[PDB]
Design an enzyme around this catalytic site. Structure first.
Site, mmCIF file in Angstrom:
data_model
loop_
_atom_site.group_PDB
_atom_site.id
_atom_site.type_symbol
_atom_site.label_atom_id
_atom_site.label_comp_id
_atom_site.label_asym_id
_atom_site.label_seq_id
_atom_site.Cartn_x
_atom_site.Cartn_y
_atom_site.Cartn_z
ATOM 1 C CG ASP A 1 -0.655 10.385 16.298
ATOM 2 O OD1 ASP A 1 -0.486 11.386 15.571
ATOM 3 O OD2 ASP A 1 -0.142 9.273 16.052
ATOM 4 C CB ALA B 1 4.493 2.295 11.076
ATOM 5 C CB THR B 2 6.274 0.774 5.753
ATOM 6 O OG1 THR B 2 7.339 1.734 5.760
ATOM 7 C CG2 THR B 2 5.838 0.522 4.317
ATOM 8 C CB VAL B 3 0.421 0.647 5.561
ATOM 9 C CG1 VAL B 3 -0.804 -0.250 5.474
ATOM 10 C CG2 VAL B 3 0.224 1.733 6.608
ATOM 11 C CG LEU C 1 -2.031 -1.157 1.146
ATOM 12 C CD1 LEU C 1 -2.842 -1.170 2.432
ATOM 13 C CD2 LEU C 1 -2.939 -0.991 -0.064
ATOM 14 N N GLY C 2 1.038 1.935 1.116
ATOM 15 C CA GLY C 2 1.877 3.117 1.157
ATOM 16 C C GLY C 2 2.790 3.159 2.366
ATOM 17 C CD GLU C 3 7.163 3.441 2.779
ATOM 18 O OE1 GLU C 3 7.514 3.416 3.976
ATOM 19 O OE2 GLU C 3 7.383 2.501 1.986
ATOM 20 N N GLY C 4 4.301 5.981 5.620
ATOM 21 C CA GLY C 4 3.695 6.632 6.765
ATOM 22 C C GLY C 4 4.706 7.499 7.488
#
Lengths: 103, 60, 299, 65
Positions: C125, C12-14, C6-9
């Site tokens: 957050d 944390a990388t999903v 999927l993508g990064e963040g």
């Protein structure tokens, strides 16, 4: 992407220079361990294999800049200090976005 | 040519007396990289060399 | 068993990989950590209470949890899969329009924060994307990477945290004490983003964010928010008055203004919470919210 | 090396070796030295020859690195 390939090529060339430097150390260590005069021809052919190795390296390179990086490329030290991020962003025209802070 | 390194810099005077004690003779060559001042290392001198009695002794 | 990426963040990388035994799709969020160093902290406990205490607390407005495993280096998270989020609705993609569907967003968001405040848990957050949406349209949160168990007294803690776009006015000056108003500040900011479909507070660091908030909402005076000059970290700006909130937003009813004004209050002790917000005149009218079936989904 | 100049002397005499006393002597002093470079002290490399390095390990490297 072009600058990334140039910086990565420096590490590939630096590793070959370290192996060539360590190769002369292995020849000097075994130069007299098993040599009692007849074994002297191997040292003459040692530089011949080192000269041809340098000729096959100076040609396929576009003259890389003199840098002091690590050829192995591992966990290099940065600063390990609470430096946060930018210099308080400092606006001027239209603001953008800055990533959040983490522990 | 098999190059070496430096042994704590200070160790140098003892090597000059151990080589000549046996039979081989040492001959420290040229090149350097410490204590510079006259700008760089090419100063200013015309390349037009003359006097053949000095050029033959220079190349020798 | 890797399936799709999927993508990064932020940290944390999903990863969309189907886990074992449980046939549910798991979105693994691998946190980049260390293990090569000797005396290294490795895993951070900022998410330890997330993958160990969420199994006990059950709530529909709170994200779920199955199991948890790791070894300092790679800490693979086991969380349920979600369809889309909220940033894709406003940012870039502008085709997906929600006519009078924002009421269902704030109704399911305050219920999630009320359940966490009852168990003495703050979601420190808040950013315009954690509101994850599933297939049924159930509004759930993302991760609890910055949760903390608080109590009656309020002492000093961390600073310069939370996304800079959504920041409380008391957090930008570096106040040691805080309260419920920390999580109740971004509630109106998300509501202000779904109306005009534009970033309501496009600011930079802590110095630039103070300019955008004060020039639109105002400067806390003595009658509004007391105790301001006593804080050491304080800066003197202009005497900002206060732009009304019923002229900036076009599609906004009379009952909607009774909630936006109470959320952007500069006084944390007088700021409205979650119980008093659900009992207002906005969540008790004729235009009822949608359960989640009529809510459109992005492509 | 002294072994190369010996073959030229034997060809000049035309079928005749130079006695044999000075033949075994051609093994004393060799070509060795030191070079100062980036190491800011001494870098041990002399000539592309090989007999100038073999007869040296049993003196300096045996007592100090």
């Amino acid at each position: 992407q072009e600058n990334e390939q140039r910086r990565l090529f420096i590490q590939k060339e630096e590793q070959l220079q370290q192996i060539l430097k360590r190769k002369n150390k292995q020849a000097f260590l075994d130069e007299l361990e098993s040599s009692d005069l007849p074994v002297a021809l191997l040292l003459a052919q040692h530089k011949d294999r080192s000269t041809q190795l340098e000729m096959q390296l100076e040609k396929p390179k576009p003259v890389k800049p003199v840098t002091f990086s690590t050829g192995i490329k591992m966990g290099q030290h940065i600063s390990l200090a609470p430096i946060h991020k930018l210099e308080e962003a400092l606006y001027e025209y239209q603001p953008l976005q800055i990533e959040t802070y983490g522990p | 040519t098999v190059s070496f390194e430096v042994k704590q810099e200070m160790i140098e005077e003892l090597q000059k007396r151990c080589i000549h004690l046996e039979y081989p003779l040492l001959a420290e060559y040229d090149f350097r990289n410490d204590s510079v001042n006259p700008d760089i290392n090419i100063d200013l001198k015309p390349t037009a060399v003359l006097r053949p009695y000095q050029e033959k002794s220079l190349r020798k | 068993e890797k399936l799709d990426f999927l993508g990064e963040g932020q940290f944390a990388t999903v990863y969309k990989a189907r886990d074992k035994n449980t046939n549910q799709i798991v979105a693994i969020k691998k946190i980049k950590l260390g293990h090569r160093s000797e005396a290294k902290d490795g895993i951070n406990r900022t998410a330890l209470r997330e993958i160990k205490l969420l199994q006990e607390l059950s709530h529909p407005n709170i994200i779920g949890l199955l199991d948890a495993f790791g070894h300092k280096s790679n800490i693979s998270l086991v969380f349920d899969f979600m369809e889309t989020d909220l940033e894709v609705i406003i940012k870039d993609n502008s085709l997906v329009l929600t006519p009078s569907h924002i009421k269902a967003y704030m109704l399911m968001t305050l219920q999630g924060l009320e359940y966490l405040h009852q168990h003495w848990i703050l979601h420190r957050d808040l950013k315009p994307n954690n509101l994850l949406l599933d297939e049924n349209g159930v509004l759930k949160l993302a991760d609890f990477g910055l949760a903390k168990s608080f109590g009656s007294p309020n002492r000093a803690y961390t600073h310069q945290v939370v996304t800079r776009w959504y920041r409380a006015p008391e957090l930008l000056f570096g106040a040691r004490m805080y309260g419920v108003g920390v999580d109740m500040w971004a509630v109106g900011c998300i509501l202000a983003e779904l109306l005009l479909r534009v970033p309501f507070l496009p600011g930079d660091s802590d110095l630039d964010q103070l300019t955008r908030i004060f020039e639109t909402l105002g400067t806390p005076t003595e009658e509004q928010w007391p105790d301001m000059c006593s804080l050491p970290d304080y800066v003197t700006f202009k005497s900002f008055p206060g732009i009304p909130l019923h002229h900036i937003f076009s599609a906004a009813g009379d009952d909607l203004l009774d909630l936006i004004q109470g959320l952007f209050l500069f006084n944390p002790c007088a700021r409205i919470t979650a119980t008093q917000a659900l009992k207002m005149k906005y969540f008790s009218n004729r235009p009822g919210p949608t359960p989640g079936c009529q809510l459109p989904r992005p492509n | 090396q002294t072994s190369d100049i010996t073959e030229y002397l034997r060809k000049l005499s035309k079928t005749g070796v130079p006695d044999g006393i000075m033949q075994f002597i051609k093994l004393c002093t060799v070509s060795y030295g030191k070079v100062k470079l980036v190491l800011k002290h001494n870098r041990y490399f002399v000539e592309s020859c090989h007999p100038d390095v073999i007869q040296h390990l049993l003196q300096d490297p045996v007592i100090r690195e």
